[PDB]
Design a protein around this nucleic acid. Sequence first.
RNA 1: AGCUGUCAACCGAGCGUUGAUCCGAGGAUGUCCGAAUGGGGAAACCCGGCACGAGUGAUGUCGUGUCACCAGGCGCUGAAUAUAUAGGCGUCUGGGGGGAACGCGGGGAAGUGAAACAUCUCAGUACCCGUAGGAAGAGAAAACAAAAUGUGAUUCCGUGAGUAGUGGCGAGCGAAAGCGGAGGAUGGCUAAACCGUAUGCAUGUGAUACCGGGUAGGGGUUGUGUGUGCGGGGUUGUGGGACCUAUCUUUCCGGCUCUACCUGGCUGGAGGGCAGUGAGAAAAUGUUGUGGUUAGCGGAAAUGGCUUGGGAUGGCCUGCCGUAGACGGUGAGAGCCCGGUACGUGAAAACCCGACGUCUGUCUUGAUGGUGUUCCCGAGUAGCAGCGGGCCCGUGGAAUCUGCUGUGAAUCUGCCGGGACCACCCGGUAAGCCUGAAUACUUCCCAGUGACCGAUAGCGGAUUAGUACCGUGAGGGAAU
RNA 2: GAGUGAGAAUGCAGGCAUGAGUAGCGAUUAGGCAAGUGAGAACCUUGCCCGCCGAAAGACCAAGGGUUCCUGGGCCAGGCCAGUCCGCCCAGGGUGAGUCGGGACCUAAGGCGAGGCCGACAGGCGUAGUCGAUGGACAACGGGUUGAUAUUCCCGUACC
RNA 3: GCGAAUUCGGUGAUCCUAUGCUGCCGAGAAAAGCCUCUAGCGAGGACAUACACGGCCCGUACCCCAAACCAACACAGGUG
Lengths: 64, 63, 97
Amino acid sequence: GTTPGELRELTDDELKDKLRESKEELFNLRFQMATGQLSNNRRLRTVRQEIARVYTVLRERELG
Amino acid sequence: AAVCDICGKGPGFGKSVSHSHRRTSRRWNPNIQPVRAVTRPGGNKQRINACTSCIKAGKVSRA
Amino acid sequence: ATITDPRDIILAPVISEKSYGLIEDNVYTFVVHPDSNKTQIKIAIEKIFDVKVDSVNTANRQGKRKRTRTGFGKRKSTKRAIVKLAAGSKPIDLFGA
RNA sequence: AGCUGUCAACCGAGCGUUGAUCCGAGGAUGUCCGAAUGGGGAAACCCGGCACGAGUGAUGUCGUGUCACCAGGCGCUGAAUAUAUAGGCGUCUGGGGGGAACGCGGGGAAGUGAAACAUCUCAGUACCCGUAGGAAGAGAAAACAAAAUGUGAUUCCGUGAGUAGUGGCGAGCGAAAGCGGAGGAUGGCUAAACCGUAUGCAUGUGAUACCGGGUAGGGGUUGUGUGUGCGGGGUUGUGGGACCUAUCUUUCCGGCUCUACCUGGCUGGAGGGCAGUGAGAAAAUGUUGUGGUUAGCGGAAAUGGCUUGGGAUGGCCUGCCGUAGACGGUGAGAGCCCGGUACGUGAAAACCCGACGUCUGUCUUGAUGGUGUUCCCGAGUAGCAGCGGGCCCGUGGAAUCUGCUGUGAAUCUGCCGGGACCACCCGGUAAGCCUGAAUACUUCCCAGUGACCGAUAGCGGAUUAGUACCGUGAGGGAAU
RNA sequence: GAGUGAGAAUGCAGGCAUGAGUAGCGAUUAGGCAAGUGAGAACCUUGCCCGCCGAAAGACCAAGGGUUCCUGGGCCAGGCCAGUCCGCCCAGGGUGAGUCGGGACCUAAGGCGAGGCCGACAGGCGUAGUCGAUGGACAACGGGUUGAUAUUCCCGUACC
RNA sequence: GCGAAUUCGGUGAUCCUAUGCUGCCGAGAAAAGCCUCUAGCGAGGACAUACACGGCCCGUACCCCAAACCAACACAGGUG
Ligand SMILES: [Mg+2]
Ligand SMILES: [Mg+2]
Ligand SMILES: [Mg+2]
Ligand SMILES: [Mg+2]
Ligand SMILES: [Mg+2]
Ligand SMILES: [Mg+2]
Ligand SMILES: [Mg+2]
Ligand SMILES: [Mg+2]
Ligand SMILES: [Mg+2]
Ligand SMILES: [Mg+2]
Ligand SMILES: [Mg+2]
Ligand SMILES: [Mg+2]
Ligand SMILES: [Mg+2]
Ligand SMILES: [Mg+2]
Ligand SMILES: [Mg+2]
Ligand SMILES: [Mg+2]
Ligand SMILES: [Mg+2]
Ligand SMILES: [Mg+2]
Ligand SMILES: [Mg+2]
Ligand SMILES: [Mg+2]
Ligand SMILES: [Mg+2]
Ligand SMILES: [Mg+2]
Ligand SMILES: [Mg+2]
Ligand SMILES: [Mg+2]
Ligand SMILES: [Mg+2]
Ligand SMILES: [Mg+2]
Ligand SMILES: [Mg+2]
Ligand SMILES: [Mg+2]
Ligand SMILES: [Mg+2]
Ligand SMILES: [Mg+2]
Ligand SMILES: [Mg+2]
Ligand SMILES: [Mg+2]
Ligand SMILES: [Mg+2]
Ligand SMILES: [Mg+2]
Ligand SMILES: [Mg+2]
Ligand SMILES: [Mg+2]
Ligand SMILES: [Mg+2]
Ligand SMILES: [Mg+2]
Ligand SMILES: [Mg+2]
Ligand SMILES: [Mg+2]
Ligand SMILES: [Mg+2]
Ligand SMILES: [Mg+2]
Ligand SMILES: [Mg+2]
Ligand SMILES: [Mg+2]
Ligand SMILES: [Mg+2]
Ligand SMILES: [Mg+2]
Ligand SMILES: [Mg+2]
Ligand SMILES: [Mg+2]
Ligand SMILES: [Mg+2]
Ligand SMILES: [Mg+2]
Ligand SMILES: [Mg+2]
Ligand SMILES: [Mg+2]
Ligand SMILES: [Mg+2]
Ligand SMILES: [Mg+2]
Ligand SMILES: [Mg+2]
Ligand SMILES: [Mg+2]
Ligand SMILES: [Mg+2]
Ligand SMILES: [Mg+2]
Ligand SMILES: [Mg+2]
Ligand SMILES: [Mg+2]
Ligand SMILES: [Mg+2]
Ligand SMILES: [Mg+2]
Ligand SMILES: [Mg+2]
Ligand SMILES: [Mg+2]
Ligand SMILES: [Mg+2]
Ligand SMILES: [Mg+2]
Ligand SMILES: [Mg+2]
Ligand SMILES: [Mg+2]
Ligand SMILES: [Mg+2]
Ligand SMILES: [Mg+2]
Ligand SMILES: [Mg+2]
Ligand SMILES: [Zn+2]
């Protein structure tokens, strides 16, 4: 839900915070999907792609 | 024992032909002898295989 | 830079008659990563839900071979952790009861 | 301007002019196995060391790195054993495996044919082994030729020619010279003899020594001898090179040239020349080019009438475009309905090309042809012999080339070849090395074409296809 | 210009006849009745009998198989008949270990094998090693529980 | 849900003591493990108590003299 653009003003530690918050979110809605009370399915994909985006930006910061 | 350790002279392959011109494959092997030569003037000896051509030409010092 | 957090290990809860019957005795079944061990699972479960975990028992289940006009295919091979919580009995309520 | 690959749709949700799906380029992530390489293993699954973090009350546990073996550089150490070596420790840099065909170097059948069969053939084939490259190999005369004041590195193609030959003169096999062409680079570089240097090994006459010389002084390139490296110098066939031998002497000056005076080389610097990613030593790098490749975009002209029809893209009649009447699709034969075609336009980035500069190197302390000798011109090599291989040539009178074994020279009034051999003539200059083009092939990608097949055909495979299935396994292998 | 003409190759493929509604329907135990279910019952469910095994035709494993196990549903193909049933079809579920059986312990026959030696090359053996149980070492017992696991879960008491 | 009595004997192993004992020739694995000794490491350390903990990976369903394995079959055969 957040463009990779506005992830470049965030430092390493707060990018890491964003990433762990997102991983916790993903665990929660994975449980909700398993128990049957998640109707919105595209939420899983968006959060999974957000995690991938956060790693991508971190690696780009490391290398250049 | 058919490769020289110095010049790599290996066997050659040809035919042994009988009186009935009955050719069979055989090998001309090199005349490699077990030499035990020195690399240093001092005289420490290491055992190798050297064809008699290399012995004759003095490529190995059996000091 | 990878970050490893506990939730990357446990994937789904097992929602079944037997799983609920164990829940009623304060024992929780999860689907876990196929390459985990009981020590890692215990640490992760204690770190996520903030409980004391007594025991973890693991089972490996092979995938069901299903037929088709093409032939056979196979499902995932999964492994499950049955986790027994301490006597304090602070329930875990992400299962729906 | 619609999208969430597909079989293969249904449900459940969503995204999209704030530019999604899609396409091209460069990147990131990239579990496990596999050369597989921390150790092990029944490939894809088991067990670790060390370092830095994480996490726990602590052990447990997690994350990221790193840890195979060989070969070669460099540094340290130098067993038995003294010199020392073999080895050991460390730090680097490579190697390993795969691949359809084409290349090169080796090993090498049998069925078969000979109307039997053994020489011979098949056939240097099939297969195997070692190695490549984008091509390879070959390549710059120790060649041909034949008395012509002749050709001139190699490779390939056509002939010569099924000829000369060869052959249990059986079945069979089978040239080259010459001649016509594709290409061009009749291309390059070393060794040696001498000169200088540096170092190593045996040495001092330890003293009148070396130095181009005369003068004077000191008194050691150890005097010397030798081997190796580096640089000059040379690079040849009418032989050439070196050593001394001769006239005119041409970019500036300085330093060296045992020492200082004048003279002989070597060396610096500013020139200028000439070349270069080349075979002729390489490397790095800028700048440019409406050069190419990897997505695309535009692109003229019929809603035409009448009629049959479910539907015109049929029939009849009208217009129109055409640098476009290629080919498809659209409800039946469409140049004017769609995609396109002819024809133009387009690249941020990456890659492949040239071109101009930095850069790199060389040449100029210097040129030229003469006049007369000594040295040099690739050594366990050539040649010779024995036993083989291969040449059209099956041992023949058997040259040329070549392997194993034995013996074993000369440096040019030499040595090799010209089908035994000898003499004379002619051609050439082995035992050192590089080398483009013309030639062979297609795993893969792009674009096309077919008097090619059209579902028992064409690939085994138009569909689950190397699938199902059969076999312990190599392997065999459908039908739709 | 031809992949140009079939009736024969114990020819190849496919479809279909003849035998023929014929043989067979796979042991040496053997079934019956009442009721139920259901469209349909010799074959399924329940009861009561009868019979067979009983050093097994019972109970538990290894190897091998691979979901065949349990629950719900099904009845086209398979079952040598029918089938409401099924080891068959479909969906969901089910396998819990410090002590069991292995590894993380150890080696045997053997395998591979750093360096190694041998061999034209391809390779052959092999040292140190390192794997390799069919063996050696090593700590848990009784009861209960599920439709489906049980020295594993729970209960009681232990041991390393 | 509640739940009685459970005492004496006889017989008796192919199972245990037993990796024993006795005979015999055919002359009957290895390694770890354990115990022990020193080399060595060493300023702390040994036994005990109590409490709190960690105990890893793989198999475990079902068949298994069988219509579930080897036999093309729901096969009169085979299977420790
Ligand atoms: Mg050898
Ligand atoms: Mg030969
Ligand atoms: Mg022969
Ligand atoms: Mg990652
Ligand atoms: Mg337990
Ligand atoms: Mg387990
Ligand atoms: Mg099924
Ligand atoms: Mg894209
Ligand atoms: Mg890409
Ligand atoms: Mg490994
Ligand atoms: Mg290995
Ligand atoms: Mg080294
Ligand atoms: Mg020494
Ligand atoms: Mg290779
Ligand atoms: Mg023959
Ligand atoms: Mg014959
Ligand atoms: Mg015949
Ligand atoms: Mg070419
Ligand atoms: Mg070449
Ligand atoms: Mg010819
Ligand atoms: Mg021949
Ligand atoms: Mg020189
Ligand atoms: Mg030179
Ligand atoms: Mg001449
Ligand atoms: Mg367009
Ligand atoms: Mg009409
Ligand atoms: Mg018309
Ligand atoms: Mg048409
Ligand atoms: Mg057309
Ligand atoms: Mg010469
Ligand atoms: Mg011959
Ligand atoms: Mg001859
Ligand atoms: Mg060459
Ligand atoms: Mg076909
Ligand atoms: Mg047809
Ligand atoms: Mg076929
Ligand atoms: Mg098979
Ligand atoms: Mg025909
Ligand atoms: Mg016919
Ligand atoms: Mg017929
Ligand atoms: Mg037939
Ligand atoms: Mg009939
Ligand atoms: Mg009859
Ligand atoms: Mg009858
Ligand atoms: Mg009958
Ligand atoms: Mg029967
Ligand atoms: Mg009845
Ligand atoms: Mg009886
Ligand atoms: Mg009995
Ligand atoms: Mg039984
Ligand atoms: Mg059943
Ligand atoms: Mg049926
Ligand atoms: Mg039936
Ligand atoms: Mg039923
Ligand atoms: Mg059933
Ligand atoms: Mg334990
Ligand atoms: Mg062994
Ligand atoms: Mg080796
Ligand atoms: Mg071996
Ligand atoms: Mg082991
Ligand atoms: Mg065992
Ligand atoms: Mg059971
Ligand atoms: Mg029990
Ligand atoms: Mg199993
Ligand atoms: Mg079990
Ligand atoms: Mg069981
Ligand atoms: Mg079993
Ligand atoms: Mg039966
Ligand atoms: Mg069967
Ligand atoms: Mg049977
Ligand atoms: Mg038996
Ligand atoms: Zn030799």
